[PDB]
Amino acid sequence: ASLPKTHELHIFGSFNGVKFDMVGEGTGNPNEGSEELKLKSTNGPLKFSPYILVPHLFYQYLPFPDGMSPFQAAMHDGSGYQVHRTIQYEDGASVTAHYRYTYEGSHIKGEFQVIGTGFPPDGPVMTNKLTAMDWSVTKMLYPNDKTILSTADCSYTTTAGKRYQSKMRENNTFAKPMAADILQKQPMFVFRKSELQHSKTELTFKEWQKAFTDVM
Amino acid sequence: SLPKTHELHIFGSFNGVKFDMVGEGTGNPNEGSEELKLKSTNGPLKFSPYILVPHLFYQYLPFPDGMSPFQAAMHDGSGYQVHRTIQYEDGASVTAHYRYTYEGSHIKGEFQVIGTGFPPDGPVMTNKLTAMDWSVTKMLYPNDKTILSTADCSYTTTAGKRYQSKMRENNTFAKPMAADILQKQPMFVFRKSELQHSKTELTFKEWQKAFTDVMSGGSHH
Amino acid sequence: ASLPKTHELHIFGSFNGVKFDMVGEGTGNPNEGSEELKLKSTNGPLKFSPYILVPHLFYQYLPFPDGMSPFQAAMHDGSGYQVHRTIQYEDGASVTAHYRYTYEGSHIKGEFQVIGTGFPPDGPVMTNKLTAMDWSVTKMLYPNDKTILSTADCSYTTTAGKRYQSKMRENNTFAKPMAADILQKQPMFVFRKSELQHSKTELTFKEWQKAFTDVMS
Amino acid sequence: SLPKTHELHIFGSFNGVKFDMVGEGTGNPNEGSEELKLKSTNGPLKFSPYILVPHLFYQYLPFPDGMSPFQAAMHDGSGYQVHRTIQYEDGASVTAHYRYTYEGSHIKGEFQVIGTGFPPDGPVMTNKLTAMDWSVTKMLYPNDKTILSTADCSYTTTAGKRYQSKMRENNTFAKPMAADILQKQPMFVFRKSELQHSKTELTFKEWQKAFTDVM
């Protein structure tokens, strides 16, 4: 029974029908909601903006303001959760994703499937015009004691100085009920910052996340 | 000047039935707080008064480092307009248009609010809404005269189930926003609201706070 | 107690916070769902693509396969309906509209408020690059006996060859319940074709509409 | 070749719980008709079988003047992939990915379907759906290898209230679509479906008709 210290990821799928596959590993601090990840392609250069991957690059590192997050609680007792995520982009592209995890003590192993379609060949993803993912606020609600619905209006900056917007929605489905200290505090917001460096084949990702019910 | 007092005429219809109210209130533009009391001019409201909350004054919202663009546009008299849509989970929709005139530190609002498709057995027409959940709005500036604001909103209900909606608006400015405002995006706003009501009268309070970050600088120690 | 033959329109509102106002008159045929309208601006050149007005340019002209549409039925008995429409455009613009009607025999008077915002100044609406409204299919459902919910995915062709897409949603709210034989046939689809010619100050509009529950029978 | 027969392996999960079905069918690619029989490989389904309807073969769809792009992509073997999202009014969502391979006039489908957020007391998890309403899909071709299709879908339910969803998908082709396809936009498709189910199998039929016009 542990909170995480290290993780590894196998992420795979396709963009516009062309497969991709990466593997890597990282660390984080589950008291602080910080994480680091290094990935490498197993199949040559990426054929799309690496910034498209940012949401897909570990809420087990997210504490809540007064104790473990439900994500942490489900790792700590092994019962776990699954993530089912949809992203609709303003130019008509769509991404669906499914995150599965296994745990070995303080080590997480993720297997993530990400499928993207409808990215215009001349758009900012396929022509590498994204420059950074804006800071975000996610809203979480708990429609039942095993399900979190999370929503965020997301945006990237681009080289043309126009933002590239999307709507992100997801269910987090838990094998066991969430705790009562969790379920009674709604809505729960989470502020996130991300940083990405990249080459054609390798990515270096960091995330900082903080849960909040109030800013006043 | 910055505002101290305001009044509102809010009118339109819900499910094709007209409504009309007039109200007066006050606010603190340094702190993002406001209060408003209204009375119906046409008898008891036939829908949950909670449905009116977002429609019951960003001139009271300061920004983190100075006047909000809303405040600046009142201060120089150029002004802005609000065009908002709300789509509810049970298929209802509300559209709203907010116009303002100013007389020194006094705001006068004229708001048209039109709602349709509220199920006769749903929580709006059966008065099951109990409170508006605290919210975070995201703002972006697609061009120098236009703010796009989005929020995922929810009410608690007597059934213990939330009643969710998607709120979207454009704020259209007659003159460009200041360059220093446009340079910091996204801007978020956290809001809290309280409503007391009868069939014909209501008391509204709101607290709003703009923020770009919730994390510490990290240079303590 | 009549079905329509003639109509007039006052349409007004704003686009990107700038007012507009138009008036005109037309005719149509309630047997076949055809209509024609001519409009003129009362305040000089329109500052936006006149194609953006198309959906706002008369379902009283729409018959149903075997009898009156609910729209026809509500004009015929004077009880009436109101329209509340939202249109969300792919580039983040939004239009809301409210249609109200009064009737004098076979003549309809429309007063339409249309408010649009968030059109990018460099986009196809504000730079007049829309070239045609694609033919459309609207889906109608009747969630209660006085309310129609209609939805359509709409698109314009543009001078750049890429389509300019939107999502159109409306409620039509009736003073009296719709007839049982209307309510029993759902969903009800409507196929529409439109044609527009325009200048900076004037336009001529035509629509053809046809209701259908099936294309296989 | 145009298809005569098909088989399906459909798998994934609903509210975190795995399902897996296999089955086979036939169809008429000149008329746009198909039928399929399916069985669970691991026990009775824990959700309304009607939720599977969209996931239960556009190779059987002709176009008004010739092959659909789907048919043409089978005929030359180059193929297409489907990536579909469905957002339901009560907050549930389904994502799906369909892959196909071929031998002669036979199609083999491999479909991954993942559904989450279905309320435990809702019409899917308590089996209150009664039928899929007839639908109209709008198709556009943003580029010569990509179809975007949209539909506003609804089921009837035991109590009369429709259960509504928004269906969106991309169909991604390995080779350009034919220029005579690409010229006719939008292309609409009317569909009808029929589902019967036991505890031991389901039987599915679909009829589909492409049109540019009804007038």
Distance from D199 to chain A by nearest Cα, in Å?
Answer: 26
Distance from A90 to chain C by nearest Cα, in Å?
Answer: 6
Whether B142 has its CB under 8 Å from any CB of chain C: the answer is yes
In chain A, residues with a C-beta closer than 8 Å to the C-beta of C165 are: 92
Neighbours of A76 (CB within 10 A): 16
Considering only alpha carbons, which residue of chain A is nearest residue B135? A187
Express the helix, strand and coil content of chain A in percent, nearest 5 each: 10, 55, 35
| Residues of C (11-40) whose Cβ lies below 8 Å from B | 14, 16-17
CA distance linking residue D104 with residue D23, whole number of Å: 18
Distance set, CA B39 to CA B20, B52, C24 (Å): 9, 13, 39
A115 with D83: Cβ contact below 8 A: yes
Technique used: X-ray
CA distance linking residue C26 with residue C37, whole number of Å: 4
Q: Which of B91, B143, B172 sits opposite C143 (nearest CB)?
A: B91
Neighboring chains of C (3 or more beta-carbon pairs < 8 A): A, B, D
- Angle of CA points A68, A74, A75, to nearest 5°: 90
Q: Is residue A1 part of a domain?
A: no
Q: Strand C130-133 and strand C18-29: pairing?
A: unpaired
In this structure, what CATH number is given to the domain that contains residue B57? 2.40.155.10
Whether C118 has its CB under 8 Å from any CB of chain A: the answer is no
Distance set, CA A148 to CA A139, B201, D118 (Å): 10, 37, 12
Whether B156 has its CB under 8 Å from any CB of chain C: the answer is no
The count of domains in chain B is 1
Could you tell me which residues are beta bridge partners of residue C101? C110
Whether C135 has its CB under 8 Å from any CB of chain D: the answer is yes
Q: Which residue segment(s) compose the domain that D16 sits in? A: 1-215
Could you tell me which residues are beta bridge partners of residue A55? none
Whether D76 has its CB under 8 Å from any CB of chain B: the answer is no
Considering only alpha carbons, which residue of chain A is nearest residue B184? A134
For residue D180, which amino acid is it?
D
In chain A, residues with a C-beta closer than 8 Å to the C-beta of D170 are: 94, 117-118
Considering only alpha carbons, which residue of chain A is nearest residue C93? A90
Beta-carbon contacts of residue C90 (< 8 Å; ≥ 6 apart)? A90, A91, A92, C164, C165, C166
Most C-contacting residue of B18, B95, B125 (CB-CB within 10 A), to test interface: B95
CA distance linking residue C186 with residue C43, whole number of Å: 43
Whether B89 has its CB under 8 Å from any CB of chain D: the answer is yes
Q: Is residue B217 part of a domain?
A: no
Considering only alpha carbons, which residue of chain A is nearest residue D79? A17
- Angle of CA points C25, C27, C33, to nearest 5°: 135
C191 with D213: Cβ contact below 8 A: yes
Considering only alpha carbons, which residue of chain D is nearest residue B90? D89
Closest by CA position to D18, among listed D50, D54, D47: D47
Closest by CA position to C36, among listed C202, C194, C157, C192: C194
Q: Which of B15, B85, B145 sits opposite C94 (nearest CB)?
A: B85
Considering only alpha carbons, which residue of chain B is nearest residue C93? B170
A82 with D16: Cβ contact below 8 A: yes
Most A-contacting residue of B28, B136, B193, B221 (CB-CB within 10 A), to test interface: B136
Q: Is residue A170 part of a domain?
A: yes
CA distance linking residue C179 with residue A160, whole number of Å: 55
Whether D90 has its CB under 8 Å from any CB of chain B: the answer is yes
Is there a contact between B17 and B46 (Cβ–Cβ < 8 Å)?
yes
In chain B, residues with a C-beta closer than 8 Å to the C-beta of A134 are: 185-186
In chain B, residues with a C-beta closer than 8 Å to the C-beta of A155 are: 140, 186
**Residue indicated by tokens 């601006």:** C41
Distance from A26 to chain D by nearest Cα, in Å?
Answer: 27
D91 with B91: Cβ contact below 8 A: no
Identify whether A120 is preceded by a cis peptide bond (ω within 30 of 0): no
Distance from B17 to chain A by nearest Cα, in Å?
Answer: 32
The gap from C-alpha C85 to its chain's centroid, in whole angstroms, comes to: 9
Could you tell me which residues are beta bridge partners of residue A197? A204
Resolution (A): 1.6
Tokens of A140: 């979480």
Whether A165 has its CB under 8 Å from any CB of chain C: the answer is yes
CA distance linking residue D184 with residue A145, whole number of Å: 49
Could you tell me which residues are beta bridge partners of residue A149? A141, A171
Q: Is residue A32 part of a domain?
A: yes
Beta-carbon contacts of residue D26 (< 8 Å; ≥ 6 apart)? D4, D5, D6, D34, D35
CA distance linking residue C132 with residue C195, whole number of Å: 7
D188 with C143: Cβ contact below 8 A: no
Identify whether D186 is preceded by a cis peptide bond (ω within 30 of 0): yes
Closest by CA position to C54, among listed C164, C161, C145: C164
Neighboring chains of B (3 or more beta-carbon pairs < 8 A): A, C, D
Tokens of B131: 């409170």
Is there a contact between A191 and A215 (Cβ–Cβ < 8 Å)?
no
